[PDB]
Model the fold of this input.
Amino acid sequence: KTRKESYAIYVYKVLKQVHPDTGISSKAMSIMNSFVNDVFERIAGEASRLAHYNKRSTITSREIQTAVRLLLPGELAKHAVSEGTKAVTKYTSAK
Amino acid sequence: RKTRKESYAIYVYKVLKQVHPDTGISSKAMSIMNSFVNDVFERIAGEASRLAHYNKRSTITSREIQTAVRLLLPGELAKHAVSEGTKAVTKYTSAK
Amino acid sequence: QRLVREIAQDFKTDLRFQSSAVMALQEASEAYLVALFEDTNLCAIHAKRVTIMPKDIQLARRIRGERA
Amino acid sequence: KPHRYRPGTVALREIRRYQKSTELLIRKLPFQRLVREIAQDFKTDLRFQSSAVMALQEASEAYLVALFEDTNLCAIHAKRVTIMPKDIQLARRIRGERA
Amino acid sequence: KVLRDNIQGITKPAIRRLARRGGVKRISGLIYEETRGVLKVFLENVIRDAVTYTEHAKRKTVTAMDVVYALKRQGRTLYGFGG
Amino acid sequence: KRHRKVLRDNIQGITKPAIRRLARRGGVKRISGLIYEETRGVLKVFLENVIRDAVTYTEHAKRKTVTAMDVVYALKRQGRTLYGFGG
Amino acid sequence: AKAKTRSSRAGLQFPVGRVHRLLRKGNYAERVGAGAPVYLAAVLEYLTAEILELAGNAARDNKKTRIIPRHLQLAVRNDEELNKLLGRVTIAQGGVLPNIQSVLLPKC
Amino acid sequence: AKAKTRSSRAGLQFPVGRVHRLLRKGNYAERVGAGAPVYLAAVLEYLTAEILELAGNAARDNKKTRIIPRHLQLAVRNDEELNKLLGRVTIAQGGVLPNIQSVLLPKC
Done:
């Protein structure tokens, strides 16, 4: 038993879309297990508080977007949101 | 004349009148308290919510606020702080 | 009130401030600077000089980590 | 008669050597035997999972280096080259880890 | 004769007062230029967060709350103006 | 044995060359004769504020072992989150 | 049925009632222990009574009945042990602790 | 019938489902919209795309085809936009950036 859950597969794939030859050793894969779990909590943090701040009740697409510009610095905020808006519209395109 | 704003104005007011029966408290020097209490409160509960998320336990019980209070507070205040609860819970449980 | 209404103007257009919030910045800027000078002196006295120099603010801002 | 390097040049070789590699620096076995000793009075008979004795080592050493780096500016900022104890007291003071 | 980049509106004697409060004894002549840099960095951030909430909350008025919060993110909470 | 432990002199575990390598990694060309006894103060002081938070996790969950899944969680409090052991 | 507040039952002034709600609705966990808010009430009590009793003392040093944002900042910083709970917080109109390095003062 | 992955539905490599599972179980909010978890995958898709891609360049630019943490720190310390995001962490086994101050160089 002892099923422990992680992102060991997904990171390895997104490596392949960007590099089909480079393999990633486990140590430098335990980090990316830590790194995603870090950013996921950090972004979800301010994701929640806005819903709390405005006295809303539900995280949605919007209260995530106004969380990315706070946390990720520089033009990443401008790159990522573009990779977010096209994500939902594609999603709602096949909804 | 509606939408009651909520604050700890009255509660900080009482506990002033027990360690200083004479002192009067300014308005702004009580907005600070109405922020410092909401501050420490959130830094505690929001830190308890980590312990009942790591330990897979889906509730916050007195133990959790009894280590979180032992963690955040620096050194000596831990010794007195948990004393104020322990007697509080016992007295609460002695007449629950 | 005429400085911030200008910096904010570049982040978005037509910002009507609330008169209390302008005070809120006005406390932080003083609160941010005052602490920096206090630590600035520590670098100056560490140089055996007694006057602060712009090469000490830039040092005392990299130790804290704000420089990056 | 025997060849000798000038003072200081052997150090610069290392500064380009140790900054290149990424192994640990503090001797392993004593550093664990410190953690038991220091942790001895927080609780009785503690058993450290040996995965989490190194986990301090890769987390305290990335803090000392974050210190010796940071005093090195100050000793530079005082027209000197060597770091001295008076330097660290400053270095930890700006961060806020001693005062 | 006020039409200029208002950053000079943080006048040199004002800078001197702060350093006194900070315990600075002798202030160099060049500090008056670099400080107007640092304060220009700092407000560049805190207002950057501050507008984002307001733009989010459909409010065209940046309010006292939406600067106490923005200061909270930088790890400099500001007691007194709310909470 | 079933008693006693290593509780003496270990703070001398960080010998003079042992710290020297560290200072070399930082980039210090010349080292003073008195720095060694100072960091040994600094190094131990930091270690206190990590184990004392580390142990407090274990005591709560009624364990008797500190797991890396906790020294990571103690460190996360003090800013120094530590990738590569958990998450 | 006669009602008395939990605040009376635990010998406490901060509202174990109200603090209980902000846990349930503060999204800190699905379920909050019945003995949880009370313990949170007292630990605030010791963390509000501690500052003021230090703060009121600085009021006497100024011979002022009214307690002033100046005094709190003065009270919260001298106490070395309470400092490390509020190392990175700035209090409105707090001013600074009067201190001057020994070198700036003349030798004679 | 004929179920298909929401990750595939939006064309996202990351798991759309699991993220939506940590938006309830974490008690980040009482209710989560159908739109947020998709967005949080894509950003994570983008954000872990650039930390990896840049690392992959450096290791190949050190003739090694497998990423090892020493190859992974160089992609975050040398990338100015990310360095402000990982400013606190200390990647295990990470090594440090090669840097010697100018004053440290020999006289010649």
Notes: The two ends of chain H are 77 Å apart (CA to CA). The first strand of chain H starts at residue 31 and ends at 32. The helical segments of chain H are 6-9, 16-25, 36-60, 69-77, 80-83. Residues 36-60 of chain H form the longest helix (25 residues).
